[PDB]
From a paper:
From crystals grown at 18 °C, we could acquire diffraction data up to 1.66 Å. The crystals were monoclinic with P1211 space group with two molecules of SALT in each asymmetric unit. The structure of SALT protein is predominantly composed of β-sheets (66.2%) and remaining is random coil or unstructured loops interconnecting them. There are 3 β-sheets, each composed of 4 β-strands. Interestingly, two molecules of mannose are also present in the asymmetric unit, each bound to a protein chain. Each mannose is bound to the protein through 8 H-bonds involving protein residues Gly14, Gly133, Thr134, Leu135, and Asp137. In our structure of SALT protein, both the loops are closer to the main body of the protein and have significantly lower B-factor indicating a more stable conformation. This might be the result of the bound mannose or the two mutations i.e. G62S and H74Q, which are located in vicinity of the loops. Importantly, the computed SAXS profile of our crystal structure of SALT protein is in excellent agreement with the experimental SAXS profile with a χ2 value of 1.5 indicating the dimer structure seen in our crystal structure is present in solution as well.
SALT is a one such glycine rich Man-binding lectin known to be induced in rice under the effect of salinity, elevated ionic concentration, sucrose starvation, and water deprivation. Along with SalT transcript expression induced under different stress conditions, its expression is also found to be regulated by developmental and hormonal clues. These reports emphasize on the key role of SALT protein in regulation of multiple processes including plant growth, development and stress responses. The present work delves with the detailed structural characterization of SALT protein in complex with mannose both in solution as well in crystalline state using SAXS data analysis and X-ray crystallography, respectively. Overall, our studies unequivocally prove that SALT exists as a tightly bound dimer.
Residue numbers in the entry:
A (entry chain A), B (entry chain B): 1 to 145
The structure:
């Protein structure tokens, strides 16, 4: 009914990004990265029962990390770093996502300040918000209890 | 499950600590600290309507930090560091708590890996879990959406 909204982690560059329909079920996340997180996109079923394909936020290019999820496989842990890269002061530089199936996905290069959200009980990540320009300046999460 | 349970951050020393009645409303937090977090205690109204006085977890001593909260003032941001201190490898070394009234409370000395939970919308911290022995080895939070 009410999602928990946590973040964002990263700098103040770029423009605010968000979703207008709260997610109910996260189906996929696609990240592009080099030495920093270059884009994020994600696909979910809204609380309205409709499917949304969000993004990409950021300029992309680099190498892809494609995370596919569903009714039983949930994101249970997300962490990363944010800091200086490519002559910018504070960018999301690295992301690590762990699902309930013990599938681990990593993007970028650890560099800067840590953040981490390990979820217990039934909590899981269902969506994102943040800031983007050419890169992902900052990232935040929506958490389904 | 109505609360979001996040964490813990810190090492694997000490013994697991937790609460059994889910919190509805957090009324106060008491922290003792030196170069590390030496104890935490808190009191809350449970979902059963009863008041609970939890802790102290940890051995305490040092300087006290007393955080008082209520129906309008609650914890919107909690952050900290964990890592080596004294002759130990991974302890909660520092905590910063910010309330909806823009009251900020700090305990310990920043040292080690960062963690941070900045809550948006209606989310707020209502309780804690973690690990303790002589000190607070690790700390986690319960979040009310
Ligand atoms: O996204 C990284 C960077 O991209 C562009 O240079 C601009 O949008 C900046 O404001 C932003 O910080
Ligand atoms: O709490 C810090 C330290 O205190 C005690 O001596 C023991 O419980 C340890 O296992 C613990 O790591």
């Amino acid at each position: 009914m009410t999602l928990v909204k946590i973040g964002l982690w990263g700098g103040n560059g770029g423009s605010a990004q968000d979703i207008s329909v709260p997610p109910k079920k996260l189906l996929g996340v696609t990240i592009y990265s080099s030495d920093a997180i270059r884009s994020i996109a994600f696909n979910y079923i809204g609380v309205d029962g409709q499917e949304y394909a969000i993004g990409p936020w950021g300029g992309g290019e680099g190498t892809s990390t494609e995370i596919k999820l569903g009714s039983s496989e949930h994101i249970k842990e997300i962490s990363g770093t944010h800091g200086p890269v490519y002559d910018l002061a504070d960018i999301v530089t690295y992301l690590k996502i762990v699902t309930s199936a013990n599938n681990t996905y990593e993007a970028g290069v650890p560099n800067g300040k840590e953040f981490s959200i390990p979820l217990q009980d039934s909590g899981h990540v269902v969506g994102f918000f943040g800031r983007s320009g050419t890169l992902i300046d900052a990232i935040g999460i929506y958490v389904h209890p």
